[PDB]
Amino acid sequence: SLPACPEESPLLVGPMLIEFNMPVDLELVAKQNPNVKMGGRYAPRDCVSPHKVAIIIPFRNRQEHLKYWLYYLHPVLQRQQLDYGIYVINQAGDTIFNRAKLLNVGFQEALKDYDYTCFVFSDVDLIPMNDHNAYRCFSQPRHISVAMDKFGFSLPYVQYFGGVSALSKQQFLTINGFPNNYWGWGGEDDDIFNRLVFRGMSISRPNAVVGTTRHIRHSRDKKNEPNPQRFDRIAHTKETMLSDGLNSLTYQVLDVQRYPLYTQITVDIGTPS
Ligand SMILES: CC(=O)N[C@H]1[C@H](O[C@H]2[C@@H](O)[C@@H](CO)O[C@@H](O[C@H]3[C@H](O)[C@@H](O)[C@H](O)O[C@@H]3CO)[C@@H]2O)O[C@H](CO)[C@@H](O)[C@@H]1O
Ligand SMILES: O=c1ccn([C@@H]2O[C@H](COP(=O)(O)OP(=O)(O)O)[C@@H](O)[C@H]2O)c(=O)[nH]1
Ligand SMILES: [Mn+2]
Residue type for 138, please? F
Determine if ligand 2 sits within 6 Å of the CB of residue 224: yes
Distance of CA 213 to the CA centre of its chain: 14
Say which CATH topology domain 1-273 has: Spore Coat Polysaccharide Biosynthesis Protein SpsA; Chain A (3.90.550)
Determine if ligand 2 sits within 6 Å of the CB of residue 184: no
Concatenating the DSSP letter of every residue in 193-249 gives HHHHHHTT---B---TTTTEEEE----PPTT--B-TTHHHHHTTHHHHTTTSSGGG-
Determination technique for this entry: X-ray
Q: Which residues of 180-199 are buried (b: 16+ CB within 10 A; e: fewer)?
A: bbbbbbbbbbbbbbbbbbee
Distances (CA, A) of 79 to 13, 14, 133, 182: 9, 11, 11, 35
Q: What is d(CA 73, CA 129) in angstroms, rounded to the nearest whole number?
A: 10
Determine if ligand 2 sits within 6 Å of the CB of residue 99: yes
Contact call for residues 36 and 256 (beta carbons, < 8 A): no
Q: What is d(CA 76, CA 130) in angstroms, rounded to the nearest whole number?
A: 9
Please list the alpha-helical segments (H only) found in the chain. Answer: 26-32, 63-79, 99-113, 169-174, 188-198, 230-234, 237-240
Determine if ligand 2 sits within 6 Å of the CB of residue 214: no
Q: Where exactly are the structural domains of the chain?
A: 1-273
Instruction: Single out the residue of 272, 273, 271, 267 nearest to residue 103, CA to CA.
Output: 267
> Closest ligand to 101 CA?
2
Q: What is d(CA 212, CA 207) in angstroms, rounded to the nearest whole number?
A: 9
Look at ligand 2, atom 17, and give the residue with the nearest C-alpha. Answer: 220
Dihedral sign from CA coordinates of 154, 157, 162, 166? positive
Report how far ligand 1's centroid is from the alpha carbon of 105 (Å). Answer: 26
Angle at 197 between CA 192 and CA 199, to 5 degrees: 100
Distances (CA, A) of 29 to 57, 149, 154, 238: 19, 25, 31, 44
Angle at 109 between CA 130 and CA 251, to 5 degrees: 120
Q: Known binder of ligand: residue 183?
A: no
Q: Known binder of ligand: residue 97?
A: yes
For 68-73, the CB contacts below 8 A with 24+ separation are: 68/20, 68/24, 68/127, 68/216, 69/122, 69/124, 69/125, 69/127, 70/24, 70/26, 70/29, 70/40, 70/261, 70/262, 71/24, 71/29, 72/18, 72/127, 72/128, 73/122, 73/127, 73/128, 73/135
Residue type for 219, please? S
Q: What is d(CA 57, CA 223) in angstroms, rounded to the nearest whole number?
A: 18
Q: What is d(CA 43, CA 81) in angstroms, rounded to the nearest whole number?
A: 7
Inter-axis angle of helices 188-198 and 99-113, nearest 10: 60
